[PDB]
Amino acid sequence: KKWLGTPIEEMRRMPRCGIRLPLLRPSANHTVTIRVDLLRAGEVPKPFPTHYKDLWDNKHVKMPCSEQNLYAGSRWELIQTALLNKFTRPQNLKDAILKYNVAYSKKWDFTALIDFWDKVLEEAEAQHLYQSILPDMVKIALCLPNICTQPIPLLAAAMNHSITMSQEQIASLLANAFFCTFPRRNAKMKSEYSSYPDINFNRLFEGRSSRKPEKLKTLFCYFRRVTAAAPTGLVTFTRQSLEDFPEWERCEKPLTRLHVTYEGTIEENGQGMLQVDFANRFVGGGVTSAGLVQEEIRFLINPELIISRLFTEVLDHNECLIITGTEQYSEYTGYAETYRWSRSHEDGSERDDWQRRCTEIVAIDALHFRRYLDQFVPEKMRRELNKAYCGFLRPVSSENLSAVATGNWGCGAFGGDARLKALIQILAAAAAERDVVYFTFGDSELMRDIYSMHIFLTERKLTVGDVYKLLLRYYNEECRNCGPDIKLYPFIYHAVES
Ligand SMILES: Cn1c(=O)c2[nH]c(SCCN3CCC(C(=O)O)CC3)nc2n(C)c1=O
8 A cells, every 4th residue: 555544635734724814914923024905816015114124133134235234335235236247157156246255255165156057057048047047136136125125033042923024025035145145144153143044055056066056956946937927925934932841741632643655745745734844953954055855855946945044043942933835936856866956836836815825834853863772862752742742733723733744854864763753743743633644755664664553552542641651661671771672663562562
């Protein structure tokens, strides 16, 4: 069988399962950068306010077009002069970017940008790039003060706050990131913003990996689309930080339903579900540098995700980032060394009443384990449970919650055990009262094992706490004084049947 458990057709999805959205309005915990009274399907949203307002401080994005962005001369004037030149060769673009980044002219390498333009693209593609795409990217970047007129607060640690902005505003900001115009975001030894991810794209231009051309094709697909015809929708970015976490050993909740399959993907087969991003604590991971695994791929085919890096501080253990409304612009094949851009993608997702695509993605960062046994330590298991729980919980009735679409979170490079991490997500979803749709990405044996454990536990009516106590026993009996002699799932079967 290609899938096991509850049919996926019986799982809840957006928009059909959602509650009527309240009226979109700014508030103390919701920044809204567009005119809600003029928001209409198929119309480009109007920025609010009408005239640029600047905030240059430690609570807001430092905009490149700020009159306080100085070097004293105006850095924004310098950016304008540098970018409003014909490009005909990749060195022209390098030289332009470095005119307002002089301190980094010896530090930033542009080999991948030069190789892409000169050595990957055929002549006609290169010509289209410098005659049409790059000039159009410059124009939308330089339009920033007319597009992003409202200060953008930082989603800082411990903040429970949301930003809703237009896809068009995101395009202007991402064009600026491409041209590396965001100030104070560059120095390796920075104090300010040291707890924020990279946003400027300079590391996309360095080195000779065969990955970078594929990353650039994926991003230029997006840039070509959104400069040719402005997207009309909205995107919400919500930082969520919980303080009340379950007493896992005493939770009497039953497990919820499971669909597990070794075929399909989160982004295609989990349409309308809560889609997990296997994130780095710096959201987006290496998307703007060398990474090209699950999180980076998603940030490339849905580039509006990338802008979360402009304003999202590194996630603490009790926090996540929820992004609603990003659009898929590319299709791809493979991953890492085999990742390839395939073609442009026309997103068919419905939009909700806030004109957001009905696509909800949650970034939750797993721990990186130096030693395999480290992850069975109770404090580490509880950490992962609470992280997933924070990502899944919507402080909303269970009937209005979509299923969670996820997979082997934190496995591969971070050393997580897929069978443990699957069980941890199942418990967290149960506590948040959501069903689970689990993609094993080609591993048929894992699919069978997860299904078998799930139905074993549910048929015996074990609670979340019952299972968590079994994890603690496994640690104590097979890990603390110990790889272990007995694997986790066999241990559980034996303990319960005994
Ligand atoms: C359910 N699910 C996935 O699990 C998934 N994984 C990926 S790429 C992950 C390749 N990465 C390479 C380096 C390795 C190391 O360095 O250890 C580890 C693994 N795309 C995915 N999608 C779309 C999906 O739906």
